[PDB]
Amino acid sequence: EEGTFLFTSESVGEGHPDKICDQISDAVLDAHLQQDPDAKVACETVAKTGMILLAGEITSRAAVDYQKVVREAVKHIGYDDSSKGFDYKTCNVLVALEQQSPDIAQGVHLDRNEEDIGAGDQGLMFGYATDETEECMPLTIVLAHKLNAKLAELRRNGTLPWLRPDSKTQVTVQYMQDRGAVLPIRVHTIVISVQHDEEVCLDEMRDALKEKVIKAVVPAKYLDEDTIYHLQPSGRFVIGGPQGDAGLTGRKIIVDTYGGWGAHGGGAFSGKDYTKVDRSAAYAARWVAKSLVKGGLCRRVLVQVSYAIGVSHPLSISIFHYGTSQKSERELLEIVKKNFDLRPGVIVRDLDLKKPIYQRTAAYGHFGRDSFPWEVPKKLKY
Amino acid sequence: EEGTFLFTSESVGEGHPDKICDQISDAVLDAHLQQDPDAKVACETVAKTGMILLAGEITSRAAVDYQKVVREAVKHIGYDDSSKGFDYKTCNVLVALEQQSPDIAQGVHLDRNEEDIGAGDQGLMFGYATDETEECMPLTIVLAHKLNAKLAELRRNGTLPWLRPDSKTQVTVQYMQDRGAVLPIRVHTIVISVQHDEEVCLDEMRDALKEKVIKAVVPAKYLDEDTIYHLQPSGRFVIGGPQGDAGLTGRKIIVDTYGGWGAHGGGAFSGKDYTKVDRSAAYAARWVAKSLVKGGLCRRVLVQVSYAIGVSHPLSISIFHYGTSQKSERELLEIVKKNFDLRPGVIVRDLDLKKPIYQRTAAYGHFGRDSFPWEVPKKLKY
Ligand SMILES: Cn1cc2cc(-c3cc4n[nH]c(C5CC5)c4n(-c4ccc(OC(F)F)cc4)c3=O)ccc2n1
Ligand SMILES: Cn1cc2cc(-c3cc4n[nH]c(C5CC5)c4n(-c4ccc(OC(F)F)cc4)c3=O)ccc2n1
Ligand SMILES: C[S@@+](CC[C@H](N)C(=O)[O-])C[C@H]1O[C@@H](n2cnc3c(N)ncnc32)[C@H](O)[C@@H]1O
Ligand SMILES: C[S@@+](CC[C@H](N)C(=O)[O-])C[C@H]1O[C@@H](n2cnc3c(N)ncnc32)[C@H](O)[C@@H]1O
């Protein structure tokens, strides 16, 4: 219908190989932060059949047992037997970690007052918020994440014991335009692909995915006779995890954020401490966007920020309200200037970014969940 | 001023460690395609001090010497001596490549007519085009790429022999809003960081970056007394390449596309054959967007498509013209339906995607350059 459009977002499960890497990178970050709140961490993870490799740079006073940290993260995910394609007990864990470059350290944080630390890199970052859900996230991505979480729940509780940890989901919603804001109308298409054991047949899987997964997550009001279902569309997914597809940290950046809505500056979150603005400034930009929506200044908003390595203040700040505010971009920028300080050395304090809660962010999206500091709106003064 | 806003984009050089990985992944893809046009390639690359690791899945009739292909790509980039932090002659090249999963193969392409091959994965992809430049790309990202290309040119011609291959640039432009389209007004901020030798001083570098790099790339009409320059803002960048920062394939997806403009579905391009719609459908979506702008139907346009693994036709198609077309989204969608076939097995034919030209795409952006097939607009019938 006129004034409507489709939008699609995807999500992946905890055992998707890229997501395994994000979770391991953040388990390593958390392990360091538990002993050294000021650890400098830049931990990439790579996963392929039988292998977890850590590559990157860490300067920290912590004593971390990488073998134990990696294996415990893989155990949590559920890869605990060679029949599943990967086993935390018996996989190879390889470590290629060096200190942070002294050239970066001297230009970013050495001999600097914490509030005045430089950005750990240049880059651009965006924050986004939409009033279409209470949590201020797009419905497409929320539903896609919840479908993966449901698969993991039914795997872990033994309801569907043929499930394995690697999964992907995709949701297409038809939206109505509403003066710049968007209103979900119906779910147009759902995709679910999930790794499974050798014994279960396709019909049993398709029936369970519709009845026990989709119906348990997606409100019936969004589903109708025209909704298209692609359930196990490849027909067979026994080989999975890193054995089926090499994974890397920071290869699910759109799943981690807004499912394609808003915008993205390209930076990966996992495996990085607060001085890496790819993460901290994106979290702060989400916090600003959500504060503008919860504060009633707009219904839908996009915030861009950018930095130069070694420089504390952002180089640029931009706000686009999609036509959903009575205030101009200039007025919203002035409100943001009066209420937020987007230097990394201040974001760390406001968002408590030395706390070891990062592994919890590394599956099911970094935003719209669990009342993390960047999800608690700031009361705005103007 | 009212009706203006800032936008920032970045780019990186050929020796940035993530970009090294993209180029090696695509050198491996091209090597396979030279012998087997139907090679199934999913080659991830990881780079850290002294190491190139290939991890992924390849099923191909080609006989490829990975040691030679990798080392030749690194030689081209310019890492040819231990003084530069990396040397193609003496680095470690490790290979963890297996066949493509037979479960993926059977669900995607085995026993399928080429035109009717399934998408190689689920996912979402976007195309974007803007009339602000002749090549239909945002000025921010074009300038950022050209600044890196200029550094490589002056390194290779011996003008600035202290330059090394690893670089990053960032450009902020102030734009005027123009009925949904955008008009560049001025360059607000430029960042340049580039790896250098131990002998050159900061003042010599800053002067050269302004006079021989910025002035040689950015038209003087965009630069004024208020333009901010952050040139070598870290103060020292001797350690660089993989030694300074671990690189991975598909960690520069925003640099590869539109510099943050438009939208991105999350997929990486490099190291993948045409059946991986993360690449082929994004190229086709750019081709559609550019065709709509060059055809005079809009000034600025965003196209979303999405797929399910094993299914040939896209699940969804959406078009947003930013208010720059007299035609509705419905009319533009009908034009696209009548003029394009976005099945991967048809995109391969239209865009000649079995040709080994991929290494050429893997630095300086995949779009707006060199009249690749996706940059040559299709004449539209309606
Ligand atoms: C008066 N009015 C007019 C409106 C128009 C739209 C709207 C329509 C639309 N059709 N196709 C898309 C995109 C291609 C899929 C649309 N997008 C859209 C644009 C950017 C987005 O984020 C990121 F992708 F850049 C997300 C969605 C809209 O925003 C929404 C609300 C409105 N109100
Ligand atoms: C009548 N009219 C009104 C217009 C408004 C804008 C426009 C203003 C603007 N302010 N801040 C931004 C973004 C935060 C940086 C703006 N964006 C924008 C939105 C999305 C973009 O892509 C991707 F990031 F999603 C890129 C730019 C505009 O498009 C442009 C043209 C117009 N014409
Ligand atoms: C399809 S694979 C990417 C392509 C792959 N590298 C190849 O060699 O063709 C991407 C993701 O899809 C999922 N996947 C793996 N095997 C699958 C299968 N048989 N059916 C459906 N999805 C699968 C996993 O989540 C995997 O990480
Ligand atoms: C700043 S590093 C990312 C952070 C890093 N992993 C760490 O341990 O802090 C990202 C990119 O910046 C560039 N870079 C490396 N060393 C730099 C330096 N001393 N000054 C400026 N940029 C640098 C390289 O292009 C590198 O790939």
Q: What is the CATH number of the domain that holds B214?
A: 3.30.300.10
Q: A180 CB under 6 A from ligand 1?
A: yes
Those residues with Cβ within 8 angstroms of residue A220's Cβ, 6 or more apart along the chain or in another chain: none
Distance CA B180, CA A327 (A): 19
Distance CA B217, CA B154 (A): 12
The answer to whether B331 touches B337, Cβ cutoff 8 Å, is: no
Residue to substitute from A4, A8, A52, A245, interface B, most B β-carbons within 10 A? A8
**Domain containing residue B170:** 4-11+139-239
Say whether B315 and A253 touch across the interface (CB within 8 A).
Answer: no
Ligand 2 binding pocket mutation candidate from B7, B183, B301 (most atoms within 8 A of CB):
B7
DSSP conformation class of B187: E
The CA–CA distances, whole Å, from B228 to A332, B172, B231 equal: 23, 9, 10
Asked, for residue A22, whether it belongs to a domain, the answer is: no
Render the burial of B251-274: b for 16+ CB within 10 Å, e for the rest: bbbbbbbbbbbbbbbbbbbbbbbb
Q: In chain B, whose CA is at the least distance from the CA of A6? A: B318
Assess B359–A contact: CB distance below 8 Å, yes or no: no
DSSP conformation class of B208: H
The answer to whether B365 touches B22, Cβ cutoff 8 Å, is: no
Asked, for residue B323, whether it belongs to a domain, the answer is: no
Is the four-CA dihedral A132, A138, A142, A144 of positive or negative sign? positive
What are residue B174's DSSP bridge partners?
Answer: B6, B186
Could you write out the DSSP letters of every residue in B34-73? HH-TT-EEEEEEEEETTEEEEEEEEE-S----HHHHHHHH
Distance CA B107, CA A237 (A): 9
> Is residue A279 packed enough to be buried (19+ CB in 10 Å), middle (13-18) or exposed (0-12)?
buried
Could you write out the DSSP letters of every residue in B285-326? HHHHHHHHHHTTS-SEEEEEEEE-BT--S-SEEEEE-TT--S
Asked, for residue A228, whether it belongs to a domain, the answer is: yes
Q: Ligand 1, atom 27: nearest CA belongs to which residue?
A: A261
Asked, for residue A280, whether it belongs to a domain, the answer is: no
Dihedral pair phi/psi, residue B236, rounded to 5°: -160, 130
Q: In chain A, whose CA is at the least distance from the CA of B231? A: A308
Distance CA B101, CA A201 (A): 19
Helix or strand (DSSP H, E) at A5: strand A4-12
SS3 assignment, position B157: coil
Number of domain units in chain B: 1
Q: Ligand 4: which atom is nearest the Cα of residue B235?
A: 20
Asked, for residue A176, whether it belongs to a domain, the answer is: yes
The answer to whether B73 touches B359, Cβ cutoff 8 Å, is: yes
The answer to whether B125 touches B277, Cβ cutoff 8 Å, is: yes
Structure tokens at B319: 């078009």
Distance CA A30, CA B10 (A): 30
Asked, for residue A161, whether it belongs to a domain, the answer is: yes
Asked, for residue B145, whether it belongs to a domain, the answer is: yes
The answer to whether B241 touches B17, Cβ cutoff 8 Å, is: yes
Resolution for this experimental structure (Å): 1.1
Which bin fits A365, alpha (ψ -120 to 50), beta or left (φ > 0)?
left
Residues of A in contact with B189 (CB under 8 A): 308, 315-316
Asked, for residue A70, whether it belongs to a domain, the answer is: no
Say whether A172 and B9 touch across the interface (CB within 8 A).
Answer: no
Render the burial of B82-118: b for 16+ CB within 10 Å, e for the rest: eebbbbbeebebeebbbebbebbbebbbeeeeeeebb
Distance CA B61, CA B64 (A): 9
Contacts 24+ apart (CB under 8 A), B373-378: B373/B283, B373/B287, B374/B283, B374/B284, B374/B286, B374/B287, B374/B290, B375/B135, B375/B286, B375/B287, B375/B290, B377/B287, B377/B290, B377/B291, B377/B294, B377/B295, B378/B287, B378/B291, B378/B339, B378/B340
